[PDB]
């Protein structure tokens, strides 16, 4: 059961770190696309 | 998509330069013809 524990289980102190990371990466990427999809709006400020 | 971007797209900062150029060339050429079509009117100021 020790062996199967180290194989099959997850230590949640690691998991929650992975979660915090991934959540930051998503909220980031979303907020990034808020800008990437607005950089083409600099176009029609020029000559329109 | 990078490759197809550099092939098929236009960088608009180049385009708008081409536009400004062409517009100047048209407005110019028009205003030029305002004179070229009036140089023959110097004729009938002479002997009529």
From Swiss-Prot, chains A, B:
- Where in the cell? Secreted; Bacterial flagellum
User: Which superkingdom?
Assistant: Bacteria
Query: What post-translational modification does the entry describe?
Result: Phosphorylated on tyrosine residue(s).
Q: What does this protein do?
A: Flagellin is the subunit protein which polymerizes to form the filaments of bacterial flagella.
| Family of this protein | Belongs to the bacterial flagellin family.
- What's the protein called, per UniProt? B-type flagellin
Give the source lineage, highest ranks first: Bacteria, Pseudomonadati, Pseudomonadota, Gammaproteobacteria, Pseudomonadales
In the UniProt record, the gene name given for this protein reads fliC
Covered range of the whole protein = 441 to 488 of 488
């Amino acid at each position: 059961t020790n062996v199967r524990s180290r194989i099959k289980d997850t230590d949640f102190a690691a998991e929650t770190a992975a979660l915090s990371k991934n959540q930051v990466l998503q909220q980031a990427g979303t907020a990034i696309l808020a800008q990437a999809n607005q950089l083409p709006q600099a176009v029609l400020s020029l000559l329109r």
